[PDB]
């Protein structure tokens, strides 16, 4: 079974938005090199939070491979414009990123959190997937606790989707393991690089089209970057005042 490896990642690194198919991103197919595979990106600009994964393509079947045996994106900065080489070893699933200007990201300092989602009218202030929209910056109400409120939302199911994004980009984000309804009125654990959260207020007991006020709280007091574990949220829904 013939396997083709593709570097998928951010548009700024790869020229495509997380495209893992050889026919769709032929420039990012990795070349056979000894017992491993290599892809060099020419003159990558100085920048922060470049991200990639290696995608194994065997016919229609895709396997997305993240950092050092995890499902995390490989995340690095480039200090000075340089050629970045990505190495992949099928025997170990080791991904290496090398180059004079390359520095691996090994920690996260949160300076902002954006609520990002399918905004319309009062829902996320009308912003459609705006990762850096100031109006959806959560307020830091204490050390590592963030809150935002959306008032006068029409109660609906399968209408409202959202995630949390740190530092006005997608490098550090939270959602759920599968795209599914958020727990309502109870603290729940968040998945780093997770799927969209659904805010299904009819299923939460608020009559369709009735107005509700939504209060979202994000607690990263026990978030550990090394494990990507410990971020928690609460989504409070109340009849509108
Ligand atoms: O731009 C609209 C788009 O925004 C959101 O997608 C972002 C993801 O939430 C975010 O995690 C990241 O997703 C990539 C993963 O990091 C990566 O490991 C791999 O799985 O590819 C993912 C992209 O397919 O970046 C995207 C933005 O490109 C939102 O969740 C989407 O519903 C929405 O369409």
Residue numbers in the entry: 492 to 732
Paper passage:
Ruminococcus bromii is a keystone species in the human gut that has the rare ability to degrade dietary resistant starch (RS). This bacterium secretes a suite of starch-active proteins that work together within larger complexes called amylosomes that allow R. bromii to bind and degrade RS. Starch adherence system protein 20 (Sas20) is one of the more abundant proteins assembled within amylosomes, but little could be predicted about its molecular features based on amino acid sequence. Here, we performed a structure–function analysis of Sas20 and determined that it features two discrete starch-binding domains separated by a flexible linker.
Furthermore, the crystal structure of a close homolog of Sas20 domain 2 revealed a unique bilobed starch-binding groove that targets the helical α1,4-linked glycan chains found in amorphous regions of amylopectin and crystalline regions of amylose. However, a single maltotriose molecule was captured between these modules with amino acids from both lobes coordinating the ligand. The aromatic ring of W509 in Sca5X25-2a interacts via van der Waals forces with the hexose ring of Glc3 at the reducing end. The O2 and O3 of Glc3 is stabilized by hydrogen bonding to the side chains of Sca5X25-2a N564 and Sca5X25-2b N684. The aromatic rings of W661 and side chain of K654 in Sca5X25-2b interact with the aglycone face and O2 of Glc2, respectively. The O6 of Glc2 is within 2.5 Å of the side chain of Sca5X25-2a E508. Glc1 interacts with W620, and its O2 and O3 coordinate with the side chain of N687. Sca5X25-2a and Sca5X25-2b overlay with an RMSD of 1.0 Å over 49 Cα atoms and demonstrate a conserved binding platform; when maltotriose is included in this overlay, the ligand displays the same polarity. The φ (O5-C1-O4’-C4′) and Ψ (C1-O4’-C4’-C5′) angles of maltotriose in our structure are φ = 107.5°, Ψ = −144.3° and φ = 90.8°, Ψ = −153.7°. The first φ/Ψ angles that is near the end of the chain is more obtuse, whereas the φ/Ψ angles cloistered within the binding cleft are similar to those found in double-helical amylose.
